[PDB]
Design an enzyme around this catalytic site. Sequence first.
Site, mmCIF file in Angstrom:
data_model
loop_
_atom_site.group_PDB
_atom_site.id
_atom_site.type_symbol
_atom_site.label_atom_id
_atom_site.label_comp_id
_atom_site.label_asym_id
_atom_site.label_seq_id
_atom_site.Cartn_x
_atom_site.Cartn_y
_atom_site.Cartn_z
ATOM 1 C CG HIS A 179 -0.629 -0.072 2.669
ATOM 2 N ND1 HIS A 179 -0.462 -0.869 3.392
ATOM 3 C CD2 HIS A 179 -0.200 1.101 3.261
ATOM 4 C CE1 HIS A 179 0.040 -0.613 4.546
ATOM 5 N NE2 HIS A 179 0.066 0.611 4.466
ATOM 6 C CD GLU A 193 -0.489 -4.468 2.064
ATOM 7 O OE1 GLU A 193 -1.392 -4.970 0.864
ATOM 8 O OE2 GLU A 193 -0.475 -3.361 1.746
ATOM 9 N N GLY A 247 1.055 5.786 10.881
ATOM 10 C CA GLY A 247 2.831 6.034 11.073
ATOM 11 C C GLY A 247 3.488 5.008 11.507
ATOM 12 C CB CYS A 251 2.372 0.998 7.652
ATOM 13 S SG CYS A 251 0.663 0.748 8.039
#
Length: 182
Positions: A41, A72, A146, A148
Amino acid sequence: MGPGFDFAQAIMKKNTVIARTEKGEFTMLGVYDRVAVIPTHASVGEIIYINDVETRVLDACALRDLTDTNLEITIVKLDRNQKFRDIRHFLPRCEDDYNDAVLSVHTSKFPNMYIPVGQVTNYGFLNLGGTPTHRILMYNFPTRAGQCGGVVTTTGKVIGIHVGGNGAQGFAAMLLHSYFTD
């Protein structure tokens, strides 16, 4: 404060950079040579900022399992003049549960941040921002925007990178040794 934080600190001090894309600032784990990982992402493009320096992306691969489900994790090769310490021997070979994990973050917003998240479950399937995702680890800490890309470690193992939360739980994508064979 203890041997958990010791291992986490050792990884953060030598194997992390601050990555910036058009979608934000992320903790980015360097694994070996010029290869690093970031949550998918982050939408890595042809150019990324590494510790606020313009850096060409030589390759970026958004990983999916053999059912063609999102994992991911994006593996990035960076046009950098320096290699990472090789930490592939700290990666687990199989999906597993863990005790006594630490989530470590290093950004402009959260420098030198370490969180003892405790027990880590092999959760498996998660609908993550509406995207079916596999190989999710779960910990009962209320993680926030904040965090990730944050590195999840135990004593002796680098087990995942933080990819989201629901306000009560946090979720990490597994790191497996087999992702980084060359």
